[PDB]
Each structure stands twice: as C-alpha cells, then as structure tokens.
Design a protein around this ligand. Structure first.
Ligand SMILES: N#C[Se-]
Ligand SMILES: [Cu+2]
Ligand SMILES: [Cu+2]
Ligand SMILES: [Cu+2]
Ligand SMILES: [Cu+2]
Ligand SMILES: [Cu+2]
Ligand SMILES: [Cu+2]
Ligand SMILES: [Cu+2]
Ligand code: NA
Ligand SMILES: [Se]
Lengths: 466, 471
C-alpha cells in the first residue's frame, strides 16, 4: 500500500555522513534514495579501538561523484565509559585522524594525519571556511591544531593548561586560576610532534555532559586532573580571520587570530560575568588569562552564518545560551554580550545544549537538548533574531548533532542510544518544526554532516558550530 | 509541482505491522535490530568492543519470543583469519584475529546482552550458516572451510552432534578434483579435549585459508584459494530443517549435494544430487560405526542455497555457475527420504551465463510463492526473482542493487524484507517488497555487509519461513 519515494523526494539531493562511535564505522547515506552509498569499518584496517568520533567534510562540486572528509577516533579508556560490560584489559590507543575520500563507488582511506604529523587529537574536527584546512581539538590532552589539507601539515598547534588557585580538586575551577596558552613546536625528526596515541593525556577519558562535576568529585582518573581545561572545539568565524577555541571547564572561548597565530581575547560564558578577559603575552610563545573564579562550565560554541553573533552554551552551574555581538569583524576585543536564552525548564546540567545548527538565512538556530537516561532527549528551536526559545520537541535517547540541508528546508539529527539502546536519524521540516521521520541507524554517532557543495554551505556545516 | 508539500514517513512504516528486523554486518563487525513500525534501531552491538579483533559477523537465527519488543534471543557467528582479506578492502593487517565465534545474544527490551560464546565452551569454531531447529530449542551451525557441522542444545549450550565431511577426488589435479567425481566420507566426531570439548577453536581445522565467497565456488579449482587440504574440500554451507521434524538437510557446495540426516538417531540417510540431468539422489553407505560414504562418478555443477517449503513437501537446492537454476524435490513422503525425487526445475534463458546465481530464498507462509535473490558480481544490479511455488515457473524479476543477499518475510505474509551489501565497500540497504503486488515499496539505509537477516519470530509456526527451513 505505501511507497517511500514521496518521503525521500521531498529532500532533494543531499548526502548524510555519520561516524558510529562504538560501532567503529563511517557511512554516507543518500537522502534521495534511502541507500547507504558507502561505509568503512576502522577495525578492518587494524585500528583495534576505532571509536569514530567527530568529522567534517569539504566542499565538493558534485558530492555524488566524490567528496572528502576528516574523521577522528578516541582510544584507551574511552572504551569504558558507556557501561558496555567488556573484559578488554588493554584497549587500542586510538587518537587517529583519518582522511577519507568517496570516489563515487566506495570510501578510500587516504591517510592517517595523526601518524603523519604526530598529533593524536580525539575531540571536535572542523573544516576552515575556505574548505582548504581543518582543526582538531582534544579535551584530555588540551591541545588543538589547524592543518593544511593539501599538504597534510600542521599550520599551528597549542597546549592550554590550568593552574588552579585552590589545589583542592573540588575547588580547582570554582576558585579560579591561570590559564596558560603555549604555541607548540615539534620535538621529533621531520617536524613531527610527540603526541600520538595516549601520549599527553591529563585525564584518562573525555568528560561526559555535566562531567565537570565528576572531575571535581574525583570520579575521573588521570595524572593531571587539576590542570585540565577540557578543550572542545576550534570553531570558525565564517568571515575569516578568527577562530574560537572552547575550553569546557573554565567556561571560556579563546579567540585566535589565524593570520599571526596568537590568542587575542577570552570570551567568558557565564551570565553576570564580563563579556571577555584580556590575554597577556608573557613569553614569545606563551600567553595567560587570569580568572578570579569560574562561575560555570560551558560547552557548545559557534557563529551564526553571517558571523555577527557568537553563541556559547553555559551548562551545569548555569544553563543557558550566551550570545555576543561579534559584528565588528576588525577587532574581537570589542565583542560583547548582547542576549541570553533562558527557560524555566533549563537548570543545572540537564538538559545540556551541546550541539546546534543555524538556518542558512540565520533566522533560527536548532539546539540539541541532551539528558542522561531515561529522560527523552530532543531539539529546541530558537529564534535567532530575538534570542527567544520557540519550541522543544522530544526525539529519542541520547540526542547528538544537527545538520541542515543547504536549502534550509530540513534539519537532520542523530541519536545514539548511549551506545547500547535506540539509535536513529531524525529529519525535521524547518517550516513546521515537526519531525517528518526517523530512519534506522546502526550508529552511536556524536557527529553528522551533510556533504557541502560550496564554501557558503560550510557556514551551516561543521565549521562554524559543532 | 514536484515539491508541493512535506511528507511524513508514518504511513510507510504503519503498513508493515509490529515486526523487528535483525541483521549482522559482515565487515562492519556489528549486529542490530530495527523496529519496522517506527524506523528506529532498537539496539546494536559491535563485536570489537568486547575484544573480538576480527568480528566478521556472518550468519544468525532468532528463537520464538512471545513478545519480541520485550525480549528475544538469537545466535550470530563470525568468521576469522584470512577471511578479512577477501573482499578487496586494502587493509595492511598482517595477523588477523582468529575469529570463528558463536555468540548468544539476548535483547532485553532496551539493549543487547552478550550472554555467551558457544564456540569457546564447546571448542567448535564454525563460521557459516546458523539455523534454528523447528521447535526453537536448538540450532545448527556449519562451516565451509573446515567442512564440519553441529547441532546444539540452546538450554545447555551443549553439542548434540558434530560431523566432518571430507572429499577424496578421483582426479588429484585441482582443476578436475570435483568434475571427475570422488567419494564423500561423513564422520560422526567425538570431542577430544577435557570438558567434552572439541578441538576446532579459531582457524583450527581449516582445509582452505578463507571461505569460498558468494559466486566463487569454482575459485578453488582455479588455484585462487590457498589451503593445506584444497582438493578435500566440500564447502559445507547449511543444515536446513524439515519443518515437519526428524530430518535436516546438509548442503555441500562443491559436490552439489544435500545430505539428509535423521536427527533422531544422528545418521545420514540419503544424498540428494542438485544438478539438472543427474539422478534425484545417491545412496549413503555405512562403512564403520561412525562413518558413511557417498560415491560420485562426476560433479556437474556446484550448488549453494537450500530450503524446505513451509509445509515440508518441497525441497529446493540452487545449482550455480555451471548451471543456474532452482532444483525442486517432492519431499511429501515424511517417512522415508530415500523416496524423495526431483519434481521440477526452474530455469530462465536470462540465467544461461555464469551469473546470475539463484541465491537465498523465502517462501510465503501459505507456500504459494517463493522469492529468490539473483546474485551477480560487480557491476551488474542484483535482484529478486518471484517464483510460483505451485507450478514452479518464474513470475517476475526485479532489479534492487549491488550484492543482494538474504530475504525474510513478515509472518502475516505481507512483506518480504531483504538486504544488499555493496561487496563490503559500495551501496548497501534494506529493501522491502509488497507480496500482493510484488513491487518494491522502499529502501532504508543500512550500515552493513549483511549476508543474513531475520525477522524475530513469535512462534514455531513462524520459523517455517525464517532461518530454520531455508538459507
Ligand atoms: N550463504 C551465504 Se552468503
Ligand atoms: Cu563538544
Ligand atoms: Cu554529541
Ligand atoms: Cu562525543
Ligand atoms: Cu515542482
Ligand atoms: Cu550459504
Ligand atoms: Cu548471502
Ligand atoms: Cu556469506
Ligand atoms: Na603507547
Ligand atoms: Se559529543
């Protein structure tokens, strides 16, 4: 009695790319036909702990004929944080960064940029606005780098360290401290860094949502637990020049000048705190930020497509969407707080607002509402002119990332079952803000992207927000 | 006017009723259950998370559950060793994991739980077809590198019987080792290790270093498959069950024979010979208390997929490559399989080349139609043949996509659900066909290399058209 053709025909020709987290795979699906075009399983290549984590794809003149993307993995004890009763004793080290190319037929594993450069980074991957480079951060090592895609080389890498005012773990961020940013230099032959695999870790796994409390309460193992800032992502100003490096635990977004590779200002997420803190150069490769206190952690961070707003989602101790007027492209030290999105139903850690996507016209922003089991996770729909919550919709357990078709007609999200229960791809019509359907997905995905065609598409892909 | 309005998927899924589709992923290393009523994947498990470093998740069968949404159980097995190297994935792994695990998995209404590894306990590492017994209380696994099969008790996870099958070729030259006939020996095995354990863990016992891939039976003849006992292979595939009980048929790809076993005294009783123009059957000769022989003057063609119809009165065996057809026997004589005779053969002019191979199947519960996949190597689209299972006449053939494997059917008979698998590298999907109109109603995405799929049954009557009666 009913065929699926009319459901798929509504979407136009877009390709959804997903990593699978504990499944270990990456896959591209054709939204016009329902077919999985291609997939790749990391363990087939001898990666024994292929926790396929974050990714971003580059503009392709015709994604159907071919496209390329970066996907990274985590490793070590990250295998142990989702309650899977595995007896594995010595997990694969992980922290790979894979370049993958779809050739119209299959995926090709082109290179391991982590092996090539020495930097093993496991958290967010983002494409630069020109589609010619990409960044990866890691929140266990607190390093990030920007890479040149053509030469697979490091343009810059930085370490970020916390020196707490109070050495007591419970009080290590609340009572403030000094954040030190160091521009790194390779230490090994051939210009290679020494951070492959688990090397450089301050803590033995990435913090989960609300994890900051777990860290403070001594539930996370590691050799440098009070020196962690939990770098998350380096998201890009669509107008060029600037990138914002999110630091979860101090709740700061450090803005970098990508032309001379120095930090220029620190935005402070918490409501009631100043717009920003100055960055002080104290040696030729070293800068500091002094914080008397840290009111709350923050996590999701991103620019609107026009680059004139920057968002940072405060979580745990405060719970809201902080908005800065970044319309002055010349000078980020003048970026200032302009609005905060709040709701009576949003307090403390959950929901955690931890991924977003804007409409291409910048009218609305869709934001994930994450909770631990068993509260239903969903999508919040925010008016992004007036900065007000419009609507919330329940989807399924453990909601992760949101992408948008480049015509702005459909949001496409993924939920991931905490790596063990229900999972799926969800598609929401941006006119009605109603779910039109869910497709099956064998994935624990913490990411998803729609393969972009132009640099303009990146403005609402994995470049400007995570 | 092509984009006049939004469409919701609800009506599409509502038509299927409450059925749960399970799939293994071959090179993806996963198993997953999908709720056809909502589109949601209820749960999945990735073998590598548990320390299985070569989880080639190959075949599975599920047991009847009074409410699959609240819980069910299934068996899925794996291959291992150099099987990782045979689908053109350019991995540089040097020493792949041993594999050949047989995992018992239970869905608890929320997640899958790995309950046990039957292969570790019994010492039988077997990596080809898994089939549920008709009572839903046991299962069989066969392996086509080691040429062994066993039936297991589910409750005790113990081995009820295991047999080796070996080939002694009349002509010792690989190229003619089957064509010119030979003797097949069937041996009832006895465990050799303490704890009543067999000595066939991992790759141990393999005659060839990797499986004969779909369509690839004759690669061994051509010198393309390495191994220590190359010309002694029969490539056992499946033990499929008579739904009337007592009998099971053991398929042996390279001799193109199905050996009928009596499950009540564990002895083979007759060998059905697949090839068109050859006799319906050959006798089995007992030559020692634990040993039987079948003698063949020639082997005309290999064969692969096999099954009984739901009523048990027809048995099908698919000849492939040197002939592509569906061979059908009249099995209506439940008392004596030595009287089972060929009664029809489905052929088609479009099937005269090397490919397509008539491949996996599923019958309608009422027995009136059987659906049979049509396999080809890249790049020809694979499809589904709709066969009239009363007159034994091809009715229709529909193109689906690359590397089509198994078919399942909702148990009210209304939809066939199949999987295609991209040769572990290109397009993959779940395909759903309406059995009233025999049209494809849609494809859903699938991250899978699946060579199997089942819909979780509620009763032993449902097993008559699940992974029990046919592959
Ligand atoms: N039997 C198989 Se693919
Ligand atoms: Cu993040
Ligand atoms: Cu996420
Ligand atoms: Cu994540
Ligand atoms: Cu139109
Ligand atoms: Cu088979
Ligand atoms: Cu198959
Ligand atoms: Cu197979
Ligand atoms: Na190491
Ligand atoms: Se995430």
């Amino acid at each position: 009695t009913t065929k699926i053709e009319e459901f798929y025909a509504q979407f136009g020709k877009y390709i959804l790319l997903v990593p699978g987290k504990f499944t270990g795979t990456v896959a591209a699906h054709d939204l016009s036909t329902g077919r999985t075009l291609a997939w790749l399983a990391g363990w087939n290549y001898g990666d024994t702990n292929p926790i396929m984590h974050h990714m971003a794809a580059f503009p392709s003149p015709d994604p159907y004929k071919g496209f390329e993307f970066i996907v990274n993995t985590q490793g070590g004890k990250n295998l142990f944080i989702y309650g899977i009763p595995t007896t594995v004793k010595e997990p694969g080290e992980g922290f790979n960064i894979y370049r993958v190319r779809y050739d119209g037929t299959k995926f090709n594993l082109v290179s391991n940029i982590a092996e090539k450069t020495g930097l093993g980074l496991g958290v967010h991957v983002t494409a630069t606005p020109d589609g010619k480079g990409f960044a990866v951060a890691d929140g266990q090592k607190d390093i990030f780098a920007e890479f040149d895609l053509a030469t697979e080389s490091v343009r810059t890498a930085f370490l970020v360290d916390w020196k707490p005012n109070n050495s007591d773990l419970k009080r290590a961020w609340l009572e403030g401290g000094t954040m030190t940013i160091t521009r790194l230099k390779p230490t090994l032959p051939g210009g290679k860094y020494d951070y492959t695999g688990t090397k450089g870790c301050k803590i033995d796994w990435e913090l989960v949502p609300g994890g900051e409390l777990f860290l403070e309460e001594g539930k996370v193992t590691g050799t440098r637990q009070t020196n962690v800032v939990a770098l998350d992502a380096f998201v890009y100003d669509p107008r060029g020049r600037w990138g914002a490096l999110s630091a979860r635990l101090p709740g700061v977004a450090i803005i970098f000048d990508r032309q001379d590779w120095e930090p220029v200002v620190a935005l402070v997420g918490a409501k009631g705190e100043p717009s920003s803190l100055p960055v002080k150069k104290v040696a030729s490769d070293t800068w500091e930020i002094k914080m008397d206190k840290v009111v709350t952690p923050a996590h999701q961070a991103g620019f609107s497509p026009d680059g004139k707003n920057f968002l940072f989602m405060n979580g745990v101790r405060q719970n809201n969407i902080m908005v800065w007027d970044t319309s002055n492209h010349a000078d980020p030290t003048k970026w200032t707080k302009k609005a905060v999105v709040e709701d009576p139903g949003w307090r403390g850690s959950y929901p955690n607002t931890f991924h977003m996507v804007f409409t291409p016209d910048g009218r609305k922003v869709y934001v994930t509402l994450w909770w631990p089991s068993p509260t239903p996770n969903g999508i919040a729909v925010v008016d992004a002119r007036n900065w007000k919550l419009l609507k919330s919709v329940d989807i399924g357990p453990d909601m992760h990332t949101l992408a948008i078709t480049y015509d702005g007609k459909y949001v496409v999200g993924v939920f991931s079952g905490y790596q063990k229960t229900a999972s799926g791809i969800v598609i929401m019509d941006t006119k009605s803000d109603e779910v039109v359907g869910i497709l099956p997905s064998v994935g624990g995905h913490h990411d998803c992207v729609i393969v972009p065609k132009t640099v303009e598409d990146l403005r609402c892909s994995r470049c400007t927000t995570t």
